[PDB]
């Protein structure tokens, strides 16, 4: 019934997971230079993001319906799922930032 | 297969968000007296509740499918989304009770 | 587009609730010996598990779509719903492990 809501420059919020992934893509395809191209490819299609790291295998990162929201399948650290706590994404299993998991794993490759 | 469950005075639980909103409506349309009618209207239709506060703009409060459950769009403090912690509703972003956000904002109007 | 993901021995993850319930069933139908058969039956069909405890009434335990995931209806302690925290399931209301609720309630029967 109210109008003084839809004459605002109105907008559907983003999906909180969607926003993480897009920020990860340009953070990661930027890191897709600091390899001797031994982390050669990262692609994101429809909330599925694949990350080729030949040293370990291939990563798959998902948007997922909840008992939680972002799903990580690590060729190295295994599978894990994450939901928002205080505005960072966190393992339901134990509570670790996936930011940290990815961070560590990515840079364990740069060593090689 | 068991009967001694359905000869109980049986009942579908409520939606936890639904219960919050109904409690907010009579808490707020009661506060729709303690204004010099400068918070003139509050309506709740189908899990959408609008709150007119001319001083700031119009509030919209939603039931929402999860990465969390109650969605707040504040003409003043902006958007935010909330899920249950220990039986109160809490910003996924930072962890603040929306009870508090609403409380503060409502009474920042009573000042005027 | 990537193959070196689907020539892995691939697998859909389980539902975190599903895994809890299956572990509860054999933990409970094992306890369906340590009664003077006064906790005579426990059945699990399609993510609905019923538990007959004549002393108190019948329990129903559910897989549920979220503002949380496992739903408990206790003939004794009432209803409650639970989501993962740090890999254990926890009352949204107050934060107690349902493991504990069930544990206590089950063994309050063994007293009799
Ligand atoms: Co969480
Ligand atoms: Co929460
Ligand atoms: Co929780």
Curated annotation (Swiss-Prot), chains A, B, C:
Changing residue 33 to A: Impairs oligomerization and iron mineralization. Coiled coil: none annotated. Changing residue 71 to A: Impairs cell growth, lowers aconitase activity and strongly decreases interaction with ISU1. It comes from the Eukaryota. This is Frataxin homolog, mitochondrial. The chain holds residues 61 to 172 of 174 of the full protein.
């Amino acid at each position: 019934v109210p109008q003084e809501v839809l004459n605002l420059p109105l907008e559907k919020a983003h999906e909180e997971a969607d926003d993480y992934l897009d920020h990860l893509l340009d953070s990661l395809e930027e890191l897709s230079e600091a390899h001797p191209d031994c982390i050669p490819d990262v692609e994101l299609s429809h909330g599925v993001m694949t990350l080729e790291i030949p040293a370990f295998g291939t990563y798959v990162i998902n948007k997922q319906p909840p008992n939680k929201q972002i799903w990580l399948a690590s060729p190295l650290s295994g599978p894990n799922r994450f939901d928002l706590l205080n505005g960072e994404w966190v393992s339901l299993r134990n509570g670790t930032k996936l930011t940290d998991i990815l961070t560590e794993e990515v840079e364990k490759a740069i060593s090689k």
